[PDB]
Amino acid sequence: RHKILHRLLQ
Amino acid sequence: RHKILHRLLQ
Amino acid sequence: HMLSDEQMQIINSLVEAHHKTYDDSYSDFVRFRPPVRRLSMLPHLADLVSYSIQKVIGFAKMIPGFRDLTAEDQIALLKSSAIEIIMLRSNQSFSLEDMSWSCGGPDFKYCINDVTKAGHTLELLEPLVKFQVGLKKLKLHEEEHVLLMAICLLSPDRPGVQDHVRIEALQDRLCDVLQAYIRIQHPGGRLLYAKMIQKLADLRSLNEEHSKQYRSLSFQPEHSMQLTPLVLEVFGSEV
Amino acid sequence: HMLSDEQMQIINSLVEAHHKTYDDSYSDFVRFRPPVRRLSMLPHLADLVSYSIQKVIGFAKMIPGFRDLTAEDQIALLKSSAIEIIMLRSNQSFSLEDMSWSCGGPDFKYCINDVTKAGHTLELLEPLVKFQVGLKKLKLHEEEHVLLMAICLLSPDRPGVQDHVRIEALQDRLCDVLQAYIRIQHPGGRLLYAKMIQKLADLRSLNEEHSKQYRSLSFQPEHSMQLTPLVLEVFGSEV
Ligand SMILES: C=C1/C(=C\C=C2/CCC[C@]3(C)[C@@H](C(CCCC(C)(C)O)CCCC(C)(C)O)CC[C@@H]23)C[C@@H](O)C[C@@H]1O
Ligand SMILES: C=C1/C(=C\C=C2/CCC[C@]3(C)[C@@H](C(CCCC(C)(C)O)CCCC(C)(C)O)CC[C@@H]23)C[C@@H](O)C[C@@H]1O
Secondary structure, eight states: OOHHHHHHTO | OOHHHHHHTO | OOOOHHHHHHHHHHHHHHHHTOOSSOGGGGSSOOOOOOOOSHHHHHHHHHHHHHHHHHHHHTSTTTTTSOHHHHHHHHHHHHHHHHHHHHGGGEETTTTEEEOSSGGGEEETTTTGGGTOOSTTTHHHHHHHHHHHTTOOOHHHHHHHHHHHHTOSOOTTOSOTTHHHHHHHHHHHHHHHHHHHHOTTOSSHHHHHHHHHHHHHHHHHHHHHHHHHHHHSHHHHTTSOHHHHHHSSSOO | OOOOHHHHHHHHHHHHHHHHTOOSSOGGGGSSOOOOOOOOSHHHHHHHHHHHHHHHHHHHHTSTTTTTSOHHHHHHHHHHHHHHHHHHHHGGGEETTTTEEEOSSGGGEEETTTTGGGTOOSTTTHHHHHHHHHHHTTOOOHHHHHHHHHHHHTOSOOTTOSOTTHHHHHHHHHHHHHHHHHHHHOTTOSSHHHHHHHHHHHHHHHHHHHHHHHHHHHHSHHHHTTSOHHHHHHSSSOO
């Protein structure tokens, strides 16, 4: 999923 | 799974 | 008319437990991520809570009869009762003079507002203070305070709980020691017991209010990344 | 014999990017969990790395052509190249005088030993210093340093990568600007380019050594609970 990494890449 | 919580309860 | 050994030995274990897991100097707080007064307090308070959970797990492990439960039931009780155990123990640092938790210089003096900078409002932060005050005023003995935390931790009424019959007996043994104690060792405390049990019902509500607010916060990845693995795991639903 | 606009504009973007995501004062380090000299440095260094990852993601987002890739390929490149980007940028704080990263008073002066108190040995910690020295000695220009990080981030050879054909072209555009630059703006640097590329091959090795050591550490819950969600997620395998 990569919840965090997704939000960070905007 | 509760990896952390398991190790802590010893 | 007089406590028996098994009871007395129950009180000795619980008191020693709380002592081995609660520091009145709050010295480890400098190890946390520094406080900051956009969810600026979130990093510090997450460490505060995560820290406390490790403590609660330490206290629990020593509650008589707890290690006998199954890993699963231990985990179910901790997860559900955790937040409440933290509110009960926090009362030790609560200060009626300033309506805040005083754990150090202006730095570690958490007042109702610093919690807001951690993702919480006042509509729900008001009952916490309302609860910390009534509890404080009960001027509990360390024995009753420690018991109450043990009684609260063994509440059979927890989602996820299997052996709700045994957990139920344990809590009853504890409730009995609390009653005998208050009766023989606590002069003037005739209504007390009933007042203490009422405090658990309040914890349920505060517990449900936290779940909701925490749920929103944990759902937003920009915020959850501020939490610690232990918190994410204890308050998480992946049971 | 002279750089063109698109190239010059590539260098302007990268340099501004590194500037907007790298502080030479290291002021935010006080926000981390304090260092402590049983994996005592683990809490501080986890915050250091987690912090740096947010920075690398910030730099990456501004690498020209990167936002055009798919969320998936962006994530695949970050995850695999992350640790290396951190070693490249860390060189800025490396000090040949003391063979350590100097980011503040004795507190934030990370030397080879403080990393050991974070779950790493010396057998594998030796190549890192060996690498930080050779890189330092290359006295790169900010333009070449910044390029190298961008070139390293666009390495098509990353497990998880889909569009390895485009990512490949981008890296080539960057490698060309680095060569032209070194050729026209870097006097005496005839061998340089080739020395810089060699540094990427080394990063691969250091990258593989970290994976292994981190894997062990992340597997032990008493340690992983010290890591941060972002680290757990970036270095984790749940791709
Ligand atoms: C911890 C301890 C201390 C204080 C407790 C506090 C002050 C800060 C905010 C807390 C931690 C309350 C918070 C929970 C915040 C956590 C999080 C992850 C940000 O949702 C409140 C939630 C309850 C209501 C209903 C108000 O929303 C519960 C008890 C409060 C200090 C010391 O006594 C040790 C004790 O061990
Ligand atoms: C971060 C930054 C800085 C220094 C870098 C360091 C010193 C501490 C330890 C690090 C972070 C190395 C570690 C990775 C440790 C992380 C963890 C989770 C504990 O596995 C090394 C792994 C590499 C070898 C092969 C040596 O095992 C890589 C670069 C080293 C400071 C500043 O320059 C910003 C930069 O942005």
